[PDB]
Design a protein around this ligand. Structure first.
Ligand code: HEM
Ligand SMILES: CCCCCCCCCCCC(=O)O
Length: 458
């Protein structure tokens, strides 16, 4: 049966670890995928990784009966900061289930619509900031979208205001987070032989984790000092009991999950919006269609919750953005038993399989010779539903199975509302007409050094 898996030749002691660009490891992953195809091997410090780049293999690996999220590589290091909180717990750790069952109802459609008013407030703060600063002020796109997503997440779920639009600098949490995530990846790639030369990076890693724990302590202290009668993520964490186990979250776990949601609940949405606005600006055809949609559906009147599902082109723009720019570009699967995939590839129990979504999402077999182009038309409901029927798991930016994104509907309502609001009131242009998209990677991806200007409409 089984064919040998190719891969870049390793070196003694280091395997292929030192091939990874410190600042943009995703590039290394995708260049190897271009060179060796749908599957290749890496020898890294945490074990032999297999890197799957094709929709055929990604779909098989999305079978929850045969595979599971292991929490390996970078995610395993992220446990240093958030332990067995919802994102970094292993499936056999009872705290995954306790947290899952207690927190799931906060993201039900009823609750998400309930948060629309507060999402709309934070979006308005951003709109007014840009309106008031006028058309000559360069906007640091990722900075203002991080402010929006952090403030939206914290207000709607924890009833906490960072008030990021009142402060020149981002809250210390944001830098601590970026370095904690980057260094978590770096640690998992660091070969035994070299590790001793990283003591400065190590002191800093634990200091940045302390900032995360302190910030979450601050959110929890605010709720204790100013109790509220509303139901939200944090009231669920404090009061919620799991029917199945009869348990509530420990304070240790409340801090773990608060950090988890502060990160997962804003970082990737700031990426989505930052990439989406780069792509709309660069693709004037799509810019016009998205503007034309907002004008016909919403016009100059208020954006209400009903409008979120009445903006199909904006939905398509976000879907297409997440296809080319999945802001978590790799998810991990591991086989529950020794296994064979594409009926020719030997795969060991618990062996780390990297689903390189940044490549699976360009599979020519699914998306054709236009795969690398930005075409929102591609991901309109009719064609999107067709691609999912004919090529299941062709598009997985929100992960897979019982370990898929709990926050998807929050992110979606936020991204659609913000994009509608901004296109309604503003036109957008590159600050540098010669800007070429570069990536900043903190495990997650965003545009780097992307500035634009906002001109109010008439
Ligand atoms: C555009 C925005 C977002 C993207 C692309 C995204 C993507 C993902 C992905 C891929 C996973 C799976 C990780 C894995 O398989 O290892 C995931 C899980 C998760 N996401 Fe999101 N996400 C987004 C927004 C959010 C938001 C807004 C929240 C919370 C309010 C959130 C909370 C989570 C949590 C808690 C998990 C862990 C769930 C579990 O495994 O039990 N994310 N997300
Ligand atoms: C708490 C939220 C953190 C999000 C994790 C994103 C990880 C993707 C990068 C994987 C790279 C690797 O481990 O080789």
């Amino acid at each position: 049966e089984t064919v040998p898996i190719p891969g870049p030749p390793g070196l003694p002691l280091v395997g292929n670890a030192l091939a990874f660009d410190s600042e943009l490891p995703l590039r290394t992953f995708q260049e190897f995928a271009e060179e060796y195809g749908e599957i290749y091997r890496l020898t890294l410090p945490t074990g032999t990784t297999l890197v799957v780049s094709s929709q055929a293999l990604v779909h098989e690996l999305c079978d929850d009966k045969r595979f599971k999220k292991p929490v390996a590589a970078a995610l395993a290091e992220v446990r240093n900061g958030v332990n067995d909180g919802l994102f970094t717990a292993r499936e056999e750790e009872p705290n995954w289930g306790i947290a899952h069952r207690i927190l799931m109802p906060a993201f039900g459609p009823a609750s998400i619509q309930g948060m629309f008013t507060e999402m709309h407030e934070i979006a308005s703060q951003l709109a007014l900031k840009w309106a008031r600063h006028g058309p000559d002020t360069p906007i640091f796109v990722t900075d203002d979208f991080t402010r929006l997503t952090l403030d939206t997440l914290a207000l709607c779920t924890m009833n906490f205001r960072f008030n990021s639009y009142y402060h020149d600098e981002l809250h210390p949490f944001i830098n601590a987070m970026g370095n904690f995530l980057t260094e978590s990846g770096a640690r998992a790639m660091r070969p035994a032989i070299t590790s001793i030369f990283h003591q400065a990076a190590n002191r800093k890693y634990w200091e940045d984790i302390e900032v995360l724990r302190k910030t979450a302590q601050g959110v929890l202290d605010t709720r204790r000092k100013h109790p509220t009668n509303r139901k939200d993520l944090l009231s669920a964490m404090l009061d919620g009991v799991d029917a199945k186990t009869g348990q509530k979250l420990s304070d240790s776990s409340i801090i773990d999950n608060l950090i988890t949601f502060l990160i997962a609940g804003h970082e990737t949405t700031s990426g989505l919006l930052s990439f989406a606005f780069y792509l709309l600006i660069k693709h004037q055809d799509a810019y016009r269609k998205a503007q034309e949609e907002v004008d016909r559906v919403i016009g100059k009147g208020p954006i209400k919750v009903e409008h979120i599902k009445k903006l199909p082109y904006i939905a398509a723009v976000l879907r297409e953005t997440l296809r080319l720019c999945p802001t978590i570009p790799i998810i991990n699967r591991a086989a529950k038993q020794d296994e064979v995939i594409g009926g020719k590839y030997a795969v060991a129990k618990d062996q780390r399989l990297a689903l390189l979504l940044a490549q699976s999402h360009l599979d020519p077999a699914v998306y054709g010779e236009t795969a690398k182009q930005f075409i929102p038309e591609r991901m309109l409901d009719e064609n999107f539903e067709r691609l999912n029927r004919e090529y299941p798991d062709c598009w997985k930016p929100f992960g897979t199975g019982m370990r898929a994104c709990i926050g998807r509907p929050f992110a979606w309502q936020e991204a659609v509302l913000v994009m509608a609001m901004l296109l309604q009131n503003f036109d957008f242009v590159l600050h540098d007409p010669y800007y070429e998209l570069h990536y900043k990677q903190t495990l997650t991806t965003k545009p780097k050094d992307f500035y634009m200007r906002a001109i109010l409409r008439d």
